Design a protein around this ligand. Sequence first.
Ligand SMILES: Nc1ncnc2c1ncn2[C@@H]1O[C@H](COP(=O)(O)OP(=O)(O)OP(=O)(O)O)[C@@H](O)[C@H]1O
Ligand SMILES: [Cl-]
Ligand SMILES: [Mg+2]
Length: 312
Amino acid sequence: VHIDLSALNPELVQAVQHVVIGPSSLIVHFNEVIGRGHFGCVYHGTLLDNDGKKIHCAVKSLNRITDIGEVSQFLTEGIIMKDFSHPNVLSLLGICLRSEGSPLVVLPYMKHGDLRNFIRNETHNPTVKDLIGFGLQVAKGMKFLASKKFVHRDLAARNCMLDEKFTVKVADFGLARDMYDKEFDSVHNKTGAKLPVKWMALESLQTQKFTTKSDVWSFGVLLWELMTRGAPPYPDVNTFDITVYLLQGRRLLQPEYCPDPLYEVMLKCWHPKAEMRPSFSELVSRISAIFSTFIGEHYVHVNATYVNVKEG
Ligand SMILES: Nc1ncnc2c1ncn2[C@@H]1O[C@H](COP(=O)(O)OP(=O)(O)OP(=O)(O)O)[C@@H](O)[C@H]1O
Ligand SMILES: [Cl-]
Ligand SMILES: [Mg+2]
């Protein structure tokens, strides 16, 4: 990937200067891979603060941003994202604008990793309260993004991170855009198996457009992930034909430990009409009420070999 930085709009280059982190401020430990996902690779990094204090960070390469036009748009979004501050939204510390690679985002290192692994771990023992509480934190972070008219596009439990205080931080907002654009219009992905279709709203699968209302659908799937302690949604449905599955009149089953009013909320998030789905503001209100009724005595028991659903 070669990016001709002299081909960027001068006013943009000036406008994003305060977001850009230079090589003398950042070491990316490329031999210390954290992992790879849908649209990038994450590495350990070391950032210097204003006082020259050493800061542990995570650095993500955005590998599907490969062309000047895509870099340009990303920079505009970087300026917007840098200004976000909310306890349930992962900070953007800055960006690396490279001439010989895809651009990087510099993120605070999240001590306790992602929410999906945190709940899946068999040595952890979450209660219904704990799981709903995590969902409330995610709803709050999404309520903030929605207030900024900022579409996530890749919301899922894997993209909610936990910091040293166990505060949930919604992560990877906006960054899936170019990967989606390319994979929707690729002769190598006509099946759609390269995309996270299990979290996508019906209308997003059909139209390739993403909105805050489509994030609400993803949030419903995220709640299902929470209440099953990280089960994979819809096993053996990983293609655009999830649309066929959905249109037969189907939704994810109620997890055994999912309270009835929370399952009602999930069904609202998957309303066929996007405009009839609750806002994140409404979701925070409703989930705060359901959360308040629990006292942390109902341990959620799951097993690796199957998903336990409501039966009695
Ligand atoms: N700020 C961070 N601190 C620590 N680990 C991180 C951070 N950001 C991402 N990771 C981890 O790096 C790995 C890869 O992240 P990446 O975001 O590319 O994939 P993902 O989150 O699994 O899926 P997606 O591509 O849908 O985001 C994951 O293990 C992820 O939890
Ligand atoms: Cl409980
Ligand atoms: Mg991610």
